[PDB]
């Protein structure tokens, strides 16, 4: 056994040799370890408390004596002193924890389990003694010095990262809770109590100073660059000389000071930068404001208002010319969408909220713009879209390239997605598809198939079921034409060539033709085809409208031969001219049974082309109001440069008539569909408030056509007069089925 006073002199000399680091040898280390070991194993029966008391007193005395050399120092000098003394103290205490390791494992561990909190591991005793003799009196000075060094580093200068990293490492390690040194993770109790709080409350002051000293004398365009640089720079000073847990708090505080405090100046510059379309700075501003959660809400409103206003200005620039030129209008809307879609996809990083604001902006724009207000109806926009879509697929002189045509039809479908009243587009496209398919005016059938498939992908199947039935009816009619040609070759033939395209009455929206006198050869051809038709499949009927059928006649009575193609009405009138030349309008009406208006327009076209003369050529030709007593005489001296000249060109007064007939038909279709929808709704509901009922109808039909409240009141009046949707007894609010 060895008493403490017999060994404490040598042990104290050795520990003082450790702290005043003079490059000790391992022999002295093992002599010191034997000195601790030979005392802790000698004979309230566990020796080692006295040695712990002398170690605590020695470390307290050493740190109190060390403090007197650093209390007067300030700024860089006290920080250098603290970091050098902390590194030396930490290393020499890590040595002392190995010297007094036996007391660290078999008395400190023994007396820390049995309560007795207040005695710690010798290393953790050295940190606690550091936390009470050289950290508390040098806390404010050192943290002020490192704050000033951070100020000098932020101001643009270069400063030592080693000193700051040493101070921050000391502040992190000093946070070791003494009561349970066997803790989990790194302890930051001291760190976020004397430095992180002070540094994080001083960075607020320094960035509010840079903000309202740079934003005052520089535009916001440069301030965004400076703010992005500062945010990256404080992402840098968490990994250089700070702790990794200050990253989130520091980035959040820098965002709240640089951005959130001055978000009121970003919005007033958002419109200015959007007007000049500086896409790079828009991307920089979105990348800056997006860090502020819930602050992006005002940017979407400004963006959608600007997109709507810019589109409205573009459509106003189109003016009256866009009404009669569908390509210009659709190209203007498409160009606005293309310009303000890259700005959302590239600058705004294709954000869901921003692309939703773009979609909502054009929805209020394509349906209701200057050209629609000029036509006092929102149906002019999908009608113009349908006209443009018909113009691309029409057989022009220059056929469009198939890849180019597919791309521009996809662009049209992109425009179509924002059309509110898709029903008007459906009806107009159906009629244009009819007028193209019955005349073989389609540029390419695969283009039509692709458009039908894209419409199918866009809006259900009932939207384009009629169109698909029309296309398959065209195919079936082609097969039937081939079969009738084979039958004509087999059976008795017709001198007149015959080529029909039989179409379903359910599809192909058309108008039933007026009464018509069938020519004798045409009567024979009609009877032959009906015989073949009954031979194939009999139990049905055919309407035989001659409004959209043509053919060419040989003018042998003329001075020169002609192969002039003419409509069936015009074919009958020319046959009547062949039978007798002198012929009156009243005779035309009573023999050909054609209605007077359409027959008058036919005669107007015939006089317009100078196909044959009237009873007086010197009278009005293109502006004559023909009367039943007007006589028309065959003119054999008609001259033209070509023989296959077309007289079946459309007349100017019928395009608008078909347009308004389409509007009436789609209005009746709207009425029928909303009647059926409200019937289903009241079948599933059986009682509902009036405004709730109209809201339910609007939400139920919103996927295909947004209804109008006066039309809803008209159809509900029709149904309440029809007892299908009758009123319940004595109520003005609700009713029952």
């Amino acid at each position: 056994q060895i008493g403490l006073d017999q060994i404490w002199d040598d042990l104290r000399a050795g520990i003082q040799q450790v702290y005043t680091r003079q490059s000790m040898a391992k022999s002295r280390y093992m002599e010191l370890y034997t000195h601790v070991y030979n005392y802790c194993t000698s004979v309230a029966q566990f020796v080692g408390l006295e040695l712990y008391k002398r170690l605590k007193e020695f470390l307290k005395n050493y740190l109190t004596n060390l403090l007197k050399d650093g209390e007067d120092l300030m700024d860089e000098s006290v920080l250098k002193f603290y970091t050098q003394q902390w590194e030396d103290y930490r290393f020499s205490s890590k040595v002392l924890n190995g010297i007094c390791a036996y007391l660290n494992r078999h008395w400190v561990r023994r007396e820390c389990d049995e309560g007795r909190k207040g005695i710690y591991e010798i290393y953790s005793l050295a940190l606690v003694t550091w936390r009470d003799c050289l950290f508390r009196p040098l806390n404010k000075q050192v943290t002020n010095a490192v704050l000033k060094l951070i100020e000098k580093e932020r101001n643009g200068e270069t400063i030592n990262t080693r000193l700051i990293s040493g101070v921050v490492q000391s502040y992190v390690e000093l946070g070791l809770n003494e009561d349970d040194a066997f803790a989990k993770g790194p302890t930051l109790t001291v760190y976020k109590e004397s430095f992180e709080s002070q540094f994080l409350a001083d960075t607020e002051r320094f960035y509010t100073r840079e903000s309202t000293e740079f934003l005052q004398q520089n535009p916001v365009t440069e301030y965004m660059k400076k703010a992005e640089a500062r945010l990256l720079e404080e992402q840098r000073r968490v990994q250089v000389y700070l702790h990794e847990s200050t990253q989130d708090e520091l980035a959040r505080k820098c965002e709240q000071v640089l951005i959130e405090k001055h978000l009121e100046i970003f919005h007033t510059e958002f419109q200015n930068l959007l007007d000049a379309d500086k896409n790079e700075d828009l991307g920089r501003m979105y990348n800056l404001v997006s860090r502020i959660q819930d602050g992006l809400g005002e940017l979407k409103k400004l963006l959608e208002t600007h997109i709507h206003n810019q589109g409205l200005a573009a459509i106003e620039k189109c003016g009256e010319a866009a009404l009669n030129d569908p390509k210009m209008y659709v190209q203007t809307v498409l160009d606005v969408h293309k310009k303000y879609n890259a700005l959302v996809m590239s600058a705004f990083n294709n954000d869901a909220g921003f692309v939703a604001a773009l979609d909502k902006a054009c929805g209020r724009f394509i349906n209701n713009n200057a050209v629609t207000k000029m036509a006092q109806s929102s149906s002019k926009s999908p009608e113009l879209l349908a006209r443009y879509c018909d113009s691309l697929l029409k057989k022009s002189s220059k056929n469009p390239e198939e890849a180019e045509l597919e791309d521009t039809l996809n662009q049209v479908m992109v425009v179509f997605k924002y059309i509110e009243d898709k029903d008007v587009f459906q009806k107009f496209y159906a009629k244009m598809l009819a007028k193209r398919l019955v005349h073989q005016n389609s540029a390419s059938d695969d283009a039509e198939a692709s458009m039908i498939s894209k419409l199918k992908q866009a809006c259900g199947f009932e939207y384009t079921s009629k169109l698909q039935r029309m296309f398959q009816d065209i195919g079936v009619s082609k097969d039937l034409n081939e079969q009738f040609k084979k039958h004509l070759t087999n059976s008795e033939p017709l001198d007149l060539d015959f080529s029909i395209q039989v179409l379903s009455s359910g599809s192909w929206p058309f108008q039933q033709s007026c009464t018509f006198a069938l020519p004798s050869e045409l009567e024979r051809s009609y009877q032959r085809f009906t015989a073949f038709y009954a031979s194939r499949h009999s139990g049905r009927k055919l309407t035989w409208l001659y409004q959209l059928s043509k053919g060419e006649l040989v003018t042998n009575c003329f001075k020169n031969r002609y192969t002039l193609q003419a409509s069936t009405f015009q074919m009958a009138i020319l046959l009547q001219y062949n039978t007798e030349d002198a012929y009156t309008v009243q005779q035309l009406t009573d023999s050909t049974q054609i209605k007077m208006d359409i027959l008058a327009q036919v005669l107007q076209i015939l006089l317009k082309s100078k196909l044959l003369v009237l009873e007086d050529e010197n009278a009005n030709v293109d502006e004559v109001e023909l009367k039943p007593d007007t006589l028309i005489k065959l003119y054999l001296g008609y001259k033209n440069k070509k023989l296959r000249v077309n007289i079946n060109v459309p007349m100017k007064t019928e395009q608008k008539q078909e347009q308004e007939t389409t509007h009436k038909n789609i209005e009746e279709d709207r009425k029928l569909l909303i009647q059926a929808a409200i019937v289903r709704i009241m079948k599933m509901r059986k009682v509902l408030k009036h405004q709730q009922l109209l809201g339910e109808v609007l939400t139920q039909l919103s996927s295909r056509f947004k209804p109008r409240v006066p039309v809803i009141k008209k159809c509900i009046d029709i149904l309440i007069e029809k007892e299908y949707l009758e009123r319940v007894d004595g109520e003005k609010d609700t009713y029952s089925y």
Binding site: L496, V502, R540, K550, G551, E552, T555, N556, T563
Partner: peptide, 16 residues
């Protein structure tokens, strides 16, 4: 003595 060579037509098939 007018003569017609080529003629096409369109008819509406209605189910009875």
């Amino acid at each position: 003595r007018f003569e017609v060579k080529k003629w096409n037509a369109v008819a509406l098939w209605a189910w009875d």
